[PDB]
Structure 1
Amino acid sequence: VLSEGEWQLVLHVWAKVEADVAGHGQDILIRLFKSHPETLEKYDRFKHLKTEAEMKASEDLKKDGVTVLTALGAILKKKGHHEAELKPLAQSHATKHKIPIKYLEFISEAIIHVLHSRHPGDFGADAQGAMNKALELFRKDIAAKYKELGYQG
Protein backbone atom coordinates (compact mmCIF):
# COMPACT_ATOMS: atom_id res chain seq x y z
CA VAL A 1 0.00 0.00 0.00
CA LEU A 2 1.59 3.23 -1.14
CA SER A 3 1.58 6.44 0.90
CA GLU A 4 -0.67 9.28 -0.16
CA GLY A 5 2.53 11.20 -1.17
CA GLU A 6 3.62 8.35 -3.37
CA TRP A 7 0.18 8.16 -4.99
CA GLN A 8 0.35 11.92 -5.64
CA LEU A 9 3.75 11.53 -7.41
CA VAL A 10 2.27 8.74 -9.57
CA LEU A 11 -0.72 10.93 -10.46
CA HIS A 12 1.36 13.99 -11.03
CA VAL A 13 3.45 12.35 -13.78
CA TRP A 14 0.35 10.64 -15.11
CA ALA A 15 -1.27 14.00 -15.79
CA LYS A 16 1.64 14.60 -18.11
CA VAL A 17 0.84 11.37 -19.95
CA GLU A 18 -2.79 12.61 -20.28
CA ALA A 19 -1.66 15.57 -22.31
CA ASP A 20 -0.86 13.24 -25.18
CA VAL A 21 -2.09 9.80 -24.35
CA ALA A 22 -1.66 8.46 -27.94
CA GLY A 23 1.93 9.59 -28.38
CA HIS A 24 2.86 8.14 -25.02
CA GLY A 25 1.10 4.89 -25.93
CA GLN A 26 2.96 4.68 -29.19
CA ASP A 27 6.32 5.23 -27.48
CA ILE A 28 5.57 2.62 -24.80
CA LEU A 29 4.39 -0.14 -27.16
CA ILE A 30 7.33 0.54 -29.53
CA ARG A 31 9.71 0.34 -26.59
CA LEU A 32 8.09 -2.91 -25.47
CA PHE A 33 8.39 -4.47 -28.90
CA LYS A 34 12.00 -3.32 -29.35
CA SER A 35 13.08 -4.53 -25.89
CA HIS A 36 11.03 -7.75 -25.95
CA PRO A 37 10.13 -8.74 -29.44
CA GLU A 38 8.39 -11.91 -28.37
CA THR A 39 5.58 -9.73 -27.03
CA LEU A 40 4.71 -8.40 -30.48
CA GLU A 41 3.54 -12.00 -31.29
CA LYS A 42 0.35 -11.87 -29.07
CA TYR A 43 -0.87 -8.83 -31.00
CA ASP A 44 -1.92 -10.91 -34.05
CA ARG A 45 -3.02 -7.48 -35.29
CA PHE A 46 0.56 -6.02 -35.35
CA LYS A 47 2.74 -8.89 -35.38
CA HIS A 48 3.65 -8.10 -39.02
CA LEU A 49 5.11 -4.68 -38.31
CA LYS A 50 8.86 -4.50 -38.90
CA THR A 51 10.22 -0.99 -38.60
CA GLU A 52 9.80 1.84 -36.13
CA ALA A 53 8.26 3.98 -38.87
CA GLU A 54 5.70 1.28 -39.70
CA MET A 55 4.85 1.12 -35.97
CA LYS A 56 4.42 4.91 -35.80
CA ALA A 57 2.20 4.89 -38.91
CA SER A 58 -0.06 2.10 -37.66
CA GLU A 59 -3.53 3.31 -36.68
CA ASP A 60 -4.22 0.06 -34.91
CA LEU A 61 -1.08 0.34 -32.76
CA LYS A 62 -2.00 3.98 -31.93
CA LYS A 63 -5.45 2.85 -30.88
CA ASP A 64 -4.07 0.03 -28.77
CA GLY A 65 -1.68 2.27 -26.93
CA VAL A 66 -4.58 4.55 -25.97
CA THR A 67 -6.56 1.49 -24.79
CA VAL A 68 -3.71 0.38 -22.54
CA LEU A 69 -3.00 3.75 -21.03
CA THR A 70 -6.70 4.61 -20.56
CA ALA A 71 -7.22 1.44 -18.59
CA LEU A 72 -4.02 1.79 -16.59
CA GLY A 73 -4.70 5.46 -15.83
CA ALA A 74 -8.12 4.54 -14.42
CA ILE A 75 -6.43 1.90 -12.33
CA LEU A 76 -3.79 4.22 -10.94
CA LYS A 77 -6.43 6.79 -10.04
CA LYS A 78 -8.06 4.28 -7.78
CA LYS A 79 -4.87 4.39 -5.53
CA GLY A 80 -4.88 0.62 -5.09
CA HIS A 81 -8.72 0.32 -4.71
CA HIS A 82 -8.91 -1.21 -8.15
CA GLU A 83 -10.54 -4.63 -7.74
CA ALA A 84 -13.44 -3.70 -10.02
CA GLU A 85 -11.16 -2.41 -12.73
CA LEU A 86 -8.83 -5.39 -12.59
CA LYS A 87 -11.67 -7.92 -12.78
CA PRO A 88 -12.45 -7.61 -16.58
CA LEU A 89 -8.82 -7.04 -17.41
CA ALA A 90 -7.71 -10.23 -15.60
CA GLN A 91 -10.50 -12.13 -17.34
CA SER A 92 -9.52 -11.20 -20.90
CA HIS A 93 -5.73 -11.29 -20.29
CA ALA A 94 -5.77 -14.67 -18.45
CA THR A 95 -8.44 -16.49 -20.54
CA LYS A 96 -8.31 -14.91 -23.99
CA HIS A 97 -5.08 -13.12 -24.69
CA LYS A 98 -3.00 -15.30 -22.31
CA ILE A 99 -0.58 -12.64 -21.16
CA PRO A 100 1.91 -13.93 -18.59
CA ILE A 101 2.92 -11.78 -15.68
CA LYS A 102 6.42 -11.46 -17.11
CA TYR A 103 4.93 -9.59 -20.12
CA LEU A 104 3.26 -7.20 -17.65
CA GLU A 105 6.74 -6.72 -16.20
CA PHE A 106 8.06 -5.94 -19.66
CA ILE A 107 5.35 -3.34 -20.30
CA SER A 108 5.95 -1.86 -16.84
CA GLU A 109 9.63 -1.43 -17.74
CA ALA A 110 8.63 0.31 -21.01
CA ILE A 111 6.25 2.69 -19.14
CA ILE A 112 9.01 3.58 -16.75
CA HIS A 113 11.51 4.11 -19.61
CA VAL A 114 9.14 6.42 -21.54
CA LEU A 115 8.08 8.41 -18.52
CA HIS A 116 11.77 8.99 -17.55
CA SER A 117 12.69 9.84 -21.20
CA ARG A 118 9.96 12.49 -21.55
CA HIS A 119 9.44 13.83 -18.08
CA PRO A 120 12.66 13.55 -16.14
CA GLY A 121 11.92 16.62 -14.07
CA ASP A 122 8.71 14.97 -12.86
CA PHE A 123 10.18 11.49 -12.68
CA GLY A 124 13.15 11.58 -10.25
CA ALA A 125 14.03 8.78 -7.85
CA ASP A 126 11.17 9.70 -5.61
CA ALA A 127 8.51 9.44 -8.38
CA GLN A 128 10.18 6.43 -10.09
CA GLY A 129 9.98 4.51 -6.84
CA ALA A 130 6.33 5.40 -6.35
CA MET A 131 5.45 4.37 -9.94
CA ASN A 132 7.40 1.17 -9.50
CA LYS A 133 5.42 0.35 -6.34
CA ALA A 134 2.11 1.20 -8.09
CA LEU A 135 2.89 -1.01 -11.06
CA GLU A 136 4.09 -3.80 -8.71
CA LEU A 137 0.80 -3.64 -6.84
CA PHE A 138 -1.11 -3.86 -10.14
CA ARG A 139 0.94 -6.91 -11.11
CA LYS A 140 0.59 -8.59 -7.73
CA ASP A 141 -3.20 -8.13 -7.71
CA ILE A 142 -3.74 -9.16 -11.33
CA ALA A 143 -1.60 -12.31 -10.70
CA ALA A 144 -3.87 -13.30 -7.81
CA LYS A 145 -6.85 -12.88 -10.12
CA TYR A 146 -5.24 -14.86 -12.87
CA LYS A 147 -4.84 -17.77 -10.49
CA GLU A 148 -8.48 -17.49 -9.36
CA LEU A 149 -9.40 -17.92 -13.01
CA GLY A 150 -7.18 -20.96 -13.34
CA TYR A 151 -4.26 -19.28 -15.13
CA GLN A 152 -0.59 -19.87 -14.35
CA GLY A 153 -1.55 -21.52 -11.07
Structure 2
Amino acid sequence: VLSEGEWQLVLHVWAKVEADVAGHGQDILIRLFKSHPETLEKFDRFKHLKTEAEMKASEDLKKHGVTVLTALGAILKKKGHHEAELKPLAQSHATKHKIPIKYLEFISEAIIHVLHSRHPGDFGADAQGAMNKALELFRKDIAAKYKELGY
Protein backbone atom coordinates (compact mmCIF):
# COMPACT_ATOMS: atom_id res chain seq x y z
CA VAL A 1 0.00 0.00 0.00
CA LEU A 2 1.51 3.26 -1.18
CA SER A 3 1.41 6.34 1.04
CA GLU A 4 0.06 9.67 -0.23
CA GLY A 5 3.67 10.86 -0.39
CA GLU A 6 4.65 7.94 -2.56
CA TRP A 7 1.69 8.49 -4.91
CA GLN A 8 2.68 12.15 -5.23
CA LEU A 9 6.19 11.15 -6.35
CA VAL A 10 4.75 8.66 -8.87
CA LEU A 11 2.24 11.08 -10.38
CA HIS A 12 4.72 13.96 -10.43
CA VAL A 13 7.01 12.10 -12.80
CA TRP A 14 4.07 10.60 -14.69
CA ALA A 15 2.86 14.10 -15.53
CA LYS A 16 6.25 14.61 -17.22
CA VAL A 17 5.67 11.40 -19.27
CA GLU A 18 2.40 12.63 -20.48
CA ALA A 19 4.04 15.53 -22.26
CA ASP A 20 5.44 12.99 -24.83
CA VAL A 21 3.44 9.80 -24.41
CA ALA A 22 4.56 8.42 -27.80
CA GLY A 23 8.31 8.90 -27.36
CA HIS A 24 8.25 7.28 -24.00
CA GLY A 25 6.21 4.38 -25.35
CA GLN A 26 8.79 3.75 -28.09
CA ASP A 27 11.79 3.93 -25.69
CA ILE A 28 10.01 1.50 -23.30
CA LEU A 29 8.90 -1.10 -25.80
CA ILE A 30 12.28 -1.11 -27.53
CA ARG A 31 14.15 -1.50 -24.26
CA LEU A 32 11.77 -4.36 -23.38
CA PHE A 33 12.29 -6.13 -26.70
CA LYS A 34 16.08 -5.65 -26.70
CA SER A 35 16.57 -6.68 -23.08
CA HIS A 36 14.12 -9.57 -23.21
CA PRO A 37 13.67 -10.86 -26.75
CA GLU A 38 11.07 -13.46 -25.69
CA THR A 39 8.70 -10.55 -25.16
CA LEU A 40 8.96 -9.50 -28.79
CA GLU A 41 7.93 -12.96 -29.88
CA LYS A 42 4.55 -12.50 -28.15
CA PHE A 43 3.62 -9.75 -30.63
CA ASP A 44 2.62 -11.01 -34.08
CA ARG A 45 2.49 -7.27 -35.03
CA PHE A 46 6.15 -6.74 -34.18
CA LYS A 47 8.13 -10.02 -34.39
CA HIS A 48 9.29 -9.07 -37.95
CA LEU A 49 11.44 -6.34 -36.40
CA LYS A 50 15.09 -7.49 -36.23
CA THR A 51 17.05 -4.29 -35.35
CA GLU A 52 16.64 -1.31 -33.05
CA ALA A 53 16.53 1.03 -36.07
CA GLU A 54 13.65 -0.98 -37.53
CA MET A 55 11.82 -0.76 -34.21
CA LYS A 56 12.38 3.02 -34.01
CA ALA A 57 11.02 3.36 -37.59
CA SER A 58 7.80 1.46 -36.96
CA GLU A 59 4.76 3.69 -36.62
CA ASP A 60 2.67 0.74 -35.54
CA LEU A 61 5.04 0.13 -32.64
CA LYS A 62 4.75 3.81 -31.67
CA LYS A 63 0.95 3.55 -31.77
CA HIS A 64 0.99 0.49 -29.44
CA GLY A 65 3.34 2.29 -27.05
CA VAL A 66 0.73 5.01 -26.71
CA THR A 67 -1.96 2.41 -26.03
CA VAL A 68 0.18 0.84 -23.30
CA LEU A 69 1.15 4.03 -21.53
CA THR A 70 -2.36 5.51 -21.78
CA ALA A 71 -3.71 2.38 -19.99
CA LEU A 72 -0.95 2.51 -17.38
CA GLY A 73 -1.48 6.22 -16.72
CA ALA A 74 -5.21 5.69 -16.12
CA ILE A 75 -4.29 2.91 -13.59
CA LEU A 76 -1.67 5.02 -11.79
CA LYS A 77 -4.04 7.98 -11.40
CA LYS A 78 -6.46 5.69 -9.52
CA LYS A 79 -3.78 5.40 -6.78
CA GLY A 80 -4.52 1.77 -6.04
CA HIS A 81 -8.28 1.92 -6.52
CA HIS A 82 -7.79 0.34 -9.96
CA GLU A 83 -9.93 -2.79 -9.87
CA ALA A 84 -12.12 -1.83 -12.82
CA GLU A 85 -9.16 -0.93 -14.98
CA LEU A 86 -7.29 -4.15 -14.25
CA LYS A 87 -10.10 -6.60 -14.94
CA PRO A 88 -10.08 -6.40 -18.73
CA LEU A 89 -6.29 -6.11 -18.90
CA ALA A 90 -5.64 -9.17 -16.73
CA GLN A 91 -8.28 -11.16 -18.64
CA SER A 92 -6.80 -10.34 -22.10
CA HIS A 93 -3.19 -10.73 -21.01
CA ALA A 94 -3.80 -14.10 -19.24
CA THR A 95 -6.23 -15.69 -21.67
CA LYS A 96 -5.67 -14.17 -25.12
CA HIS A 97 -2.15 -12.74 -25.30
CA LYS A 98 -0.60 -15.31 -22.85
CA ILE A 99 1.74 -12.93 -21.03
CA PRO A 100 3.53 -14.35 -17.97
CA ILE A 101 3.70 -12.09 -14.85
CA LYS A 102 7.46 -12.20 -15.26
CA TYR A 103 7.08 -10.29 -18.54
CA LEU A 104 5.16 -7.65 -16.58
CA GLU A 105 8.22 -7.39 -14.30
CA PHE A 106 10.39 -6.93 -17.41
CA ILE A 107 8.22 -4.05 -18.77
CA SER A 108 8.25 -2.49 -15.27
CA GLU A 109 12.08 -2.46 -15.38
CA ALA A 110 11.96 -0.84 -18.82
CA ILE A 111 9.54 1.87 -17.60
CA ILE A 112 11.77 2.66 -14.64
CA HIS A 113 14.89 2.78 -16.80
CA VAL A 114 13.33 5.17 -19.40
CA LEU A 115 11.90 7.42 -16.70
CA HIS A 116 15.35 7.76 -15.17
CA SER A 117 16.94 8.57 -18.51
CA ARG A 118 14.25 11.15 -19.50
CA HIS A 119 13.42 12.73 -16.06
CA PRO A 120 16.42 12.42 -13.72
CA GLY A 121 15.53 15.59 -11.74
CA ASP A 122 12.10 14.14 -10.96
CA PHE A 123 13.25 10.58 -10.68
CA GLY A 124 15.75 10.44 -7.91
CA ALA A 125 15.89 7.42 -5.56
CA ASP A 126 12.78 8.38 -3.61
CA ALA A 127 10.69 8.57 -6.76
CA GLN A 128 12.30 5.47 -8.20
CA GLY A 129 11.33 3.54 -5.06
CA ALA A 130 7.77 4.88 -5.18
CA MET A 131 7.37 3.99 -8.87
CA ASN A 132 8.76 0.53 -8.16
CA LYS A 133 6.10 0.15 -5.45
CA ALA A 134 3.35 1.30 -7.79
CA LEU A 135 4.40 -1.15 -10.50
CA GLU A 136 4.71 -3.94 -7.90
CA LEU A 137 1.12 -3.20 -6.79
CA PHE A 138 0.04 -3.42 -10.44
CA ARG A 139 1.75 -6.78 -10.81
CA LYS A 140 0.43 -8.15 -7.48
CA ASP A 141 -3.13 -7.36 -8.45
CA ILE A 142 -2.82 -8.74 -11.96
CA ALA A 143 -1.19 -11.89 -10.54
CA ALA A 144 -4.16 -12.52 -8.28
CA LYS A 145 -6.48 -12.36 -11.27
CA TYR A 146 -4.16 -14.70 -13.22
CA LYS A 147 -4.30 -17.18 -10.32
CA GLU A 148 -8.10 -17.08 -10.29
CA LEU A 149 -8.06 -17.90 -14.04
CA GLY A 150 -5.54 -20.61 -13.72
CA TYR A 151 -2.80 -18.89 -15.55
- The TM-score normalised by the length of structure 1 is 0.97
Inter-partner Cα distance in structure 1 for 2:138 and 2:147: 14
| Runs of 4+ off more than 6 Å | none
Gaps of 5+ in 2: none
What is the alpha-carbon distance in structure 2 between the residues aligned to residue 4 and residue 87 of structure 1? 24
In the aligned structure 1, how far is the partner of 2:103 from the partner of 2:82? 20
Give distance in 2, aligned partners of 1:83 and 1:125.
28
TM-score w.r.t. the length of structure 2 is: 0.99
SS at match of 1:127: helix
Percent of residue pairs identical: 99
Q: Distance in 2 between matches of 1:101 and 1:150?
A: 13
Which secondary structure state, in structure 2, belongs to the residue aligned with residue 11 of structure 1?
Answer: helix
C-alpha separation between the residues in 2 aligned to 1:134 and 1:91? 20
**CA separation in 2, counterparts of 1:16 and 1:31?**
19
What do residues 55-93 of structure 1 show as CA deviations (whole Å, max 9, x unaligned)? 111111001100110000000000000000000000100
Aligned residues: CA RMSD: 0.6
What is the aligned length?
151
> What per-residue deviation string (whole Å, max 9, x for no partner) do you get for residues 30-70 of structure 1?
00011101110001110010111111111110011001100
Structure 2 CA distance for aligned equivalents of residues 141 and 38 of structure 1: 23
| 3-state DSSP of counterpart to 2:97 | coil
How many angstroms apart in 1 are the aligned matches of 2:16 and 2:55? 23
Shift of 1:5: 0.7
Secondary structure of the residue aligned to 2:48 is coil
Deviation larger for 2-11 or 49-58: 49-58
